[PDB]
Write an enzyme that holds these catalytic residues in place. Sequence first.
Site, PDB file in Angstrom:
ATOM      1  N   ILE A  70      37.209  43.794  41.177  1.00  0.00           N
ATOM      2  CA  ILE A  70      36.107  44.873  41.237  1.00  0.00           C
ATOM      3  C   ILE A  70      36.584  46.369  40.654  1.00  0.00           C
ATOM      4  CG2 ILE A  70      35.074  43.886  43.115  1.00  0.00           C
ATOM      5  CD1 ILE A  70      36.332  45.725  44.872  1.00  0.00           C
ATOM      6  N   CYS A  71      35.677  47.113  40.087  1.00  0.00           N
ATOM      7  CA  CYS A  71      35.704  48.387  39.718  1.00  0.00           C
ATOM      8  C   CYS A  71      35.130  49.243  40.696  1.00  0.00           C
ATOM      9  CB  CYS A  71      35.141  48.414  38.349  1.00  0.00           C
ATOM     10  SG  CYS A  71      36.037  49.860  37.216  1.00  0.00           S
TER      11      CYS A  71
END
Length: 183
Positions: free
Chosen positions: A138-139
């Site tokens: 995830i960013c």
Amino acid sequence: VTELTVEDSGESLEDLMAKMKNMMADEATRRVVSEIPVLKTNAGPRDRELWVQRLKEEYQSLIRYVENNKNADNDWFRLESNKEGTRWFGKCWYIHDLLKYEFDIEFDIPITYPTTAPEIAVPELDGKTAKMYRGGKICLTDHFKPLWARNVPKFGLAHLMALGLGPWLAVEIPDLIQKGVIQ
């Protein structure tokens, strides 16, 4: 007609400059974190006896957070690690449309923890969204990586959940439900 003009109370400049900062911080963040007990020891995974002591602290923090989640019926995750605490794995439960949504999650513990936060992964939702690095990592919001740095080493994995993942779910997951990449 009395147009709204500055009227004078008994507050000093500091009473005020302070009272500014008690509007200039995030209440949500402060709310979230006030409940999560903060950590002490600045040790990383190669620091032997010191790393274990950080580890006990991590477990204590997480416990009290899972335990705050249960109290507010928001028990939204499950986690554990290998022996050396250097490798982690768990599940998160998003509710959306009174529909439950599970997701498999996993992160390591950088050499330079607690300074450097760990990069979460969701290896199944890999490809199904746009705020994700390749593989499933995830960013997060731009807010986080800097926020983490100010608090080092007081933030630990419960923080990385409650500020990192926790937000990122309430964004992406509504989005991928309506986009049907998950149903």
